[PDB]
Amino acid sequence: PREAAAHWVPFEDKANMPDNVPDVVEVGATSAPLLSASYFIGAKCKPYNDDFMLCREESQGSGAIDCLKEGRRVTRCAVSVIEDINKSCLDEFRLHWQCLEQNNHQLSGCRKAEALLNKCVFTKLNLEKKIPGLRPDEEPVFLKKDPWIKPAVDDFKSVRAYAEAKKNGTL
């Protein structure tokens, strides 16, 4: 839809959901940690996400009311991913999304924290980052050694952590 125009007053609604709709926790993460956990959500919630979208498409208009079970599953899978991150991989995750905040949510300014986080989640949770649609001939941009595009200032904490991890063989 279009954005509002020329005047607009926000209005909330203090009503509760009907009782034939079970309750579901929300995700609760803001922009940056969710951008950091996007690929790990996609690695685990592919079937649930595409089932949600397929039941929306098959409904042909009534997707808001026909797809509630499916959306609840999607929300729960995402909450599980972020709970696993917080339980196990919180320091690297926080490095990554604070690094995203000081940039303009450009993942090109955060590769040194991204590497640590991807290693951590691949070892503990067994979820790896993959950019689909590519060929075996194409290099994914998050694995390039020397890119053209680099941050103005590389994040300090991430640099110190990358250095320490290379000195301790964690990478």
Binding site: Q106, L107, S108, I131, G133, P140, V141, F142, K144, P147, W148, I149
Partner: protein, 61 residues
């Protein structure tokens, strides 16, 4: 007679420069054209390489 007059020296003066002294300077012009073409070619190599990386970052986003 002539006692305290302002007169020239005996060997005259050392000669002065009154002919045109605009010397030709610079490399031959095709050297400047080659440098231009190399500068702009390298800039295109550097820029188009950056457009492709931006495209892949867009894919990631």
């Amino acid at each position: 007679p002539s006692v305290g007059q302002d007169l020239p020296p005996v060997g005259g003066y050392e000669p002065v420069q009154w002919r045109r002294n605009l010397p030709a300077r610079g490399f031959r012009p095709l050297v400047y054209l080659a440098a231009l073409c190399g500068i702009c070619g390298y800039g295109f190599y550097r820029a188009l390489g950056g457009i492709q990386e931006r495209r892949e970052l867009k894919r990631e986003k």
